[PDB]
Write a protein that binds this DNA or RNA. Structure first.
Lengths: 634, 630
RNA sequence: AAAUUU
RNA sequence: AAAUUU
RNA sequence: CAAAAUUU
RNA sequence: CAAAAUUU
């Protein structure tokens, strides 16, 4: 058919980036802007052998920890077995035949695989063998162990909690929001649920037993209308009795970076709820998160949920922290993201910083906090939108139940329930906000105690005791270590050596200006490199190494000498065709230069990454524009 | 990745339209809005067999005509052999190695292949065998014959022409344009050339010897800047001598619907020019075609290039035609599209209509007309954009050369040239405009002669002689038969039985309103159906698309043709109707929708074959759920 | 598709 | 991608 | 990957 | 399928 020459050129370029052999031929003589790198310490085969050795030792340790016996699940209420859902949508049951079914009973099987790399081979190629070996034997990305899973589940379900003193007024002070940014919940429900964002490959939960992508029509067309009709009729107890799997959850073992020494003691449990329930509550949660302010925007906010290190965020944290005041006389600067807190106070005019963490904070989350957070979010919406008060208040009751008393399967047909309402069931929508509020309520009380003159609470022993006795929260060991802050750090200097949100804060130099950037020691970047959170062709594996190397540089590895070198070596080792191939993005052929990453963390206007091959576009299109004037004199 | 549920539903729908087995399952109980159709006259096996039989006979006749010896090509100038282009673009020669090369010399091979069906099988399945057989044996889509190709080439190249008397003023009256709709040619050349439209699978010609899609970078990056530099240095003669293939064309046989009786005498020739030269001139031609007005827009216009039968166009022709005046005293209504012309005169106050066609009109196109059209177009641009006058005047000279004296290859290495400047080399950019203008100049002069009282020219013998002697144009036999017009036709009545642009005009009834629509007898529609101008899934989709297209062209206004096309659409499996296609096209042309298209109604989508298809493919139908309930 | 974080 | 036209 | 925040 | 016009 007839097409413009521009359109033909565009189509050709798209097709050309999908032809690897063509890309190889076109870029075979192209100039490459190579990243700064560190040299090879050993050959390909030596690196592969050292990797194979460490991988064999790790697989032995993981297999041994997975063989460890687990304690009984008698700490949980036993609710029996549930029949498989018989709801039919069109030609198929919502619960697929032959799946999650033992004699008409819903069943699950916990997977604890022995695991098993390209990244480890690259580390041995460019780094000291002893350091790489010690780093890779210390931490591994694994499904964990039955023993660690049950142990952590016991702690999360059996912790004695302290009911917080919380009002909507306190929550407005600690967690301010913009009411105009809240979505209109008085709108039609179908449109609202369609607006929620989700992980397409995540499990839709019972009764779908498939990805949210595959189960979306069964949710929207069949189950969600059923649920709505029972909500508006106050007949949800009938729905639960007739269809229990509609309100069933799955306790799952989290695949995570786990310390090899503690694999038998710690495997984190999470709960996978039904899609219909999650989607309804996500209308309220995703709207509220959009309206939520952060501490840098409001001095009263204890909220770091939403904070970005980029676009001046790192410097914003320092500006916010310096406005901290003398303990007992003026307010401290406290910001919380779940279990992670940044605390700033002044003693004799000198700024000090504490970066404490809590242990299994979800078990400590009391039911009063959960109900109050739900009331705060629901009330925020019904104030701005009063026409839909009753429906969303009923959704709030479903939210509290999913967060505290949802029945759940672990392995097999037995359904269990937490004996106590206290304890957040991690995985419910709002998990991070519930944890953030609990932390902020405790730290707000701690600051009130300092204004009352209890300055001994700045000290570790008293602080640990305060959070346990008054708030049921256990301070992680080593996390209460007050440190003098370098308030105006010179070039190449750290604010403190402590980490907030997993990263240290450092000042770097651009001309004579100071740019605040995230930083970590080399060992920390090396741990992340060797332990990919990977869920296949050689090409995709080569692209994955390039993408991971670029990601770690943008996260701050560009500010560590050895990490910048390793990631540069991986990027430079990537074939030209793999760098310039068509890829799924948010063609990504740029690289993170030191200057680009400095610009990202600065308040500079956004810019594209410098190109690895500056002539790639012209070479792939086989055409470079030459200006040809029609106004010449002939 | 993190995505909205709305976006996930949109992704799912697109993917499902590409899963034909899933489409089959989800549409297995769907209600189908079946098109009106005529019944099966015979079974699949019998229809396939009768098709095979007619096909065997037709192949034999085509092979016999293809075997006929051809006459000599000595009527043309012989320019020797041209060396293969040695220009290199990076790692590859612009002229590919191993292609179009005989001992270093540019070569081509004409293809005259025999043979060419699903459509004929459908016709035998739903129509009388005798009519279908007669129809299929009369016309075939073929590459033609060597004998017919050379005969037509001789006619096109050796015809005595008459130089028209033309001015920019006559051309402004007969072909008015909107100057502001002209593209700014004062702009940078690369941008202007990237703005042009082209057939991606058409030949880029010498020296690329590949599709325009494959040759586009070699043209833009290597040849176009070489050509530009020589244009501004007046050194094009040097470029031609060093690189002659840059200015070489290929004379090719046109694959077309041809009468089997005349295959040995008639195979149409066309010229395939270099992409670089074509693209440069296409800047001017495509811009001018955008600005051109039609007879319905300007009463002075004799131009039907740009006319649409749709959106009231058919009725616009009737309104325009009735404005005709008495022969001898007031202006007739004349519109021309290449060789095709619609003429309306009033004799004794009664509207009359002539629809004549010229024969091998391109040979009759004189050099003065070609030069004048080029000058008219170049001048239009340089008047609105004067800073670029010199460049486009040089491009104008290349345009006239391509239209008249381009060296060309036919078969093998011999390069040829038309001995006379006269004669249009069909295939040059502007071919249809050159033909339209020549026709219009001749008919403007015929009208001037009528106003002089030579009203005898309304008669066949007189008109034929006038066009041959005064304009070098040969009126096709039968095309001069004036006819009384039904100025306001009744429901189901033709304006005339004559064909303009291949179609009759007819009034149909919608409510009590009249809708003017195109029309043809069933035998014409069946000829088009059995002679298509061309995986089982692709073949089934093609039948559905061809049936829909013919209904939209007017087959819906013929009882038997509507029935046959409806039978083909109804026979198409649901998955093939609803599958993702290059333009989701799951609609069908109802009689009412086609009446709407030809009316001045606001555009609407075709009625769906499966109205619940979208909801079934998505497996979801929206149910309103109010959050403001108690 | 990828990085970090809880 | 498909229809008609020159 | 259960919910998520930030980023490319 | 050489240039094209109209249409889906």
């Amino acid at each position: 058919t007839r097409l413009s020459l521009e359109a033909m050129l565009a189509e050709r370029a798209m097709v050309a980036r999908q032809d690897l052999a063509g890309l190889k031929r076109k870029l075979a003589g192209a100039d490459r802007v190579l990243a700064p790198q560190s040299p090879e310490q050993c050959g390909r085969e030596s690196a592969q052998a050292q990797a194979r050795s460490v991988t064999s030792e790790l697989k032995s340790a993981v297999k041994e920890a997975q063989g460890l016996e687990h304690q009984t699940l008698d700490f949980l209420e036993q609710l029996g077995e549930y029949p498989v859902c018989g709801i039919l949508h069109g030609d198929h049951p919502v619960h697929p035949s032959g799946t999650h079914n033992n004699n008409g009973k819903v069943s699950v099987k916990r997977q604890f695989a022995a695991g098993v790399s390209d990244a480890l081979t690259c580390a041995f190629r460019f780094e000291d063998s002893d350091l790489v070996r010690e780093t890779a034997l210390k931490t591994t990305y694994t499904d964990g162990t039955w023993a660690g899973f049950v142990q952590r589940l016991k702690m999360q379900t059996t912790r004695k909690c302290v009911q917080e003193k919380v009002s909507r007024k306190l929550l407005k002070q600690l967690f301010p929001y913009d009411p105009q940014k809240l979505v209109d919940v008085s709108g039609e429900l179908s449109e609202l649920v369609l607006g929620i964002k989700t992980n397409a490959i995540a499990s839709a939960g019972p009764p779908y037993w498939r990805t949210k992508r595959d189960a979306l029509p069964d949710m929207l067309d069949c189950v969600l209308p059923l649920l709505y009709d029972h909500i508006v009729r106050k007949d949800l107890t009938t729905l639960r009795n007739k269809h229990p799997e509609l309100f069933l959850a799955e306790c799952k073992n989290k695949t995570d970076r786990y310390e090899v020494e503690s694999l038998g003691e710690k495997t984190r449990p999470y709960f996978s709820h039904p899609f219909h329930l999650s989607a309804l509550v996500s209308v309220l949660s995703q709207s509220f998160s959009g309206a939520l302010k952060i501490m840098t925007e409001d001095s009263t906010s204890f909220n770091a949920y939403g904070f970005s290190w980029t676009n001046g965020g790192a410097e914003d944290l320092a500006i916010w922290a310096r406005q901290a005041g003398e303990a007992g006389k003026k307010p401290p600067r406290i910001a919380c993201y779940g279990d992670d807190t940044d605390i700033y106070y002044r003693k004799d005019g000198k700024l000090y910083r504490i970066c404490p963490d809590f242990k299994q904070m979800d078990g400590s989350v009391d039911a009063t906090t959960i109900e109050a957070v739900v009331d705060y979010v629901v009330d925020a919406h019904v104030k701005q939108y009063p026409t839909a008060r009753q429906f969303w208040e009923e959704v709030g009751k479903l939210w509290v139940e999913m967060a505290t008393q949802s029945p759940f399967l672990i392995d097999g047909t037995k359904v269990y329930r937490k004996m106590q309402k206290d304890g957040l069931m991690t995985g419910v929508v709002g998990t991070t906000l519930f944890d953030t509020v609990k932390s902020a309520l405790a730290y707000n009380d701690w600051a009130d105690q300092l204004m009352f003159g209890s300055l001994n609470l700045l000290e570790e022993k008293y602080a640990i005791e305060f959070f346990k006795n008054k708030h049921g929260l256990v301070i992680k060991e080593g996390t209460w270590k007050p440190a003098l802050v370098n308030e105006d750090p010179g070039f190449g200097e750290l604010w403190t050596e402590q980490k907030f949100l997993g990263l240290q804060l450092k000042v770097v130099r651009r001309e004579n200006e100071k740019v605040y950037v995230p930083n970590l020691p080399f060992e920390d970047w090396l741990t992340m490199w060797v332990t990919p959170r990977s869920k296949e062709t050689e090409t995709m594996r080569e692209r994955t190494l390039f993408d991971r190397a670029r990601g770690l540089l943008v996260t701050g590895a560009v500010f560590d000498e050895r990490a910048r070198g390793l990631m540069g070596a991986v990027i430079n080792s990537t074939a030209p065709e793999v760098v310039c191939m068509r890829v799924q993005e948010g063609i990504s052929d740029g690289y993170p230069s030191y200057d680009w990453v400095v610009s990202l963390y600065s308040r500079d206007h956004p810019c594209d990454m410098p190109r690895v091959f500056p002539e790639a576009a012209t070479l792939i299109a086989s055409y470079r524009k030459q200006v040809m004037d029609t106004r010449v004199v002939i």
